[PDB]
């Protein structure tokens, strides 16, 4: 899916991906530790799955 989209839904950093999630139904898979940090600093976006 990402290969077909090929920058249609892709990101080159973290913060811009965070904002893209904040502005659209965006997944932005990330390593768990920073996800914990972000979802604790903010309170509107939380991790799903395991």
């Amino acid at each position: 899916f990402m290969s077909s989209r090929r920058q249609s839904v892709l990101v080159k950093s973290n913060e811009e991906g965070i904002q893209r999630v904040l502005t659209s139904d965006y997944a932005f898979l990330m390593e768990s530790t920073t996800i914990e940090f972000v979802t604790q600093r903010n309170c509107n976006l939380t991790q799903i799955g395991g």
């Binding site: 920058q7 080159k12 950093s13 811009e16």
Partner: protein, 297 residues
């Protein structure tokens, strides 16, 4: 660093700090540009008459006609005179990190390219039947010159690209050149980012204009990290002079020209009208019933 000498029958050309030693870590490109049927005389006065000292591959001086590179000299010799018939002499001087010396002096004398610059625009594909109407039969090729707003590196995006004449390019290809328009550095022959501020687009075609299209867009103010006023379309892509919502995909991802774009009761395309008419008829009928009603006492 470049010393342009356009439209002068004579003038002078020499290394930076010419009586002194050349500064290191230069990379300066030079041009002798002449009118058709205007022939160029290029001359080296030696400041230092000897057979060349450091004959090697750093600190070379290239010479470019049209780009078949005529030669590269180094050390401490003069090339003999070379007579110009291509009338567009391209001179590149390079400097290393740690070999610094007497420099050089020169004397020049006189004996399908279109302009396309600004902040934004599109190179019309196969746009040759208006600029330089070339018959389709022969191989055709043209170059395109971009110039950004002061202090602006450029980003390009191809909107339509199909060179069906052949997969291979020994006949037909499209390439991009960075820096100034020389054979010095092919940026590429996907979208592209120009490192410099002046753009060079050449296209080669053969046996017809059947090439489907080369239709692409160049962007300005692509260079700076954001000060503030222009929008953060992408990382250090604050560009706006007026292109905020210009109706064209003017950024790598949709940002600048995207995301900015009582009758609700009657918003039915035809339904509202038919229903309303039937309703008026009914209301009037209700009023008729009401008149007959206020009639009995």
């Amino acid at each position: 660093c470049g010393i342009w000498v356009r439209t002068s029958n004579g003038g002078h050309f020499a290394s930076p700090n010419y009586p002194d030693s050349y500064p290191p870590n230069k990379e300066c490109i030079y041009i002798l540009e002449a009118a058709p049927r205007q022939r160029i005389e290029l001359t080296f006065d030696e400041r230092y008459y000897i057979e060349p000292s450091f004959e090697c591959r750093f600190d070379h001086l290239e010479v470019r006609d049209g780009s078949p590179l005529i030669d590269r000299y180094c050390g401490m010799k003069s090339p003999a005179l070379i007579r110009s018939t291509g009338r567009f002499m391209w001179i590149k001087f390079s400097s290393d990190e740690e070999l610094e010396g007497l420099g050089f002096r020169a004397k020049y004398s006189f004996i399908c390219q279109f302009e396309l610059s600004g902040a934004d625009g599109i190179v019309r594909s196969s746009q040759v039947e208006q600029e330089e109407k070339t018959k389709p039969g022969q191989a055709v090729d043209c170059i395109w010159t971009i110039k950004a707003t002061p202090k602006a590196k450029i980003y390009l995006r191809f909107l339509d690209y199909q060179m069906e004449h052949s997969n291979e390019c020994k006949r037909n290809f499209v390439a991009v050149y960075d820096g100034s328009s020389a054979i010095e550095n092919l940026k590429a022959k996907n979208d592209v980012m120009l490192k410099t501020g002046v753009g060079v687009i050449r296209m080669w075609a053969d046996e017809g204009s059947r090439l489907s299209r080369f239709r692409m867009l160049f962007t300005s103010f692509v260079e700076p990290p954001c000060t503030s006023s222009t929008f953060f379309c992408h990382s250090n892509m604050c560009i706006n002079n007026s292109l905020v919502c210009n109706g064209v995909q003017n950024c790598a991802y949709p940002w600048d020209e995207n995301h900015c774009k009582l009758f609700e009761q009657i918003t039915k395309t035809h339904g509202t009208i038919i229903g309303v008419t039937s309703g008026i008829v009914l209301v009037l009928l209700i009023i008729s019933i009401l008149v007959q009603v206020k009639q009995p006492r």
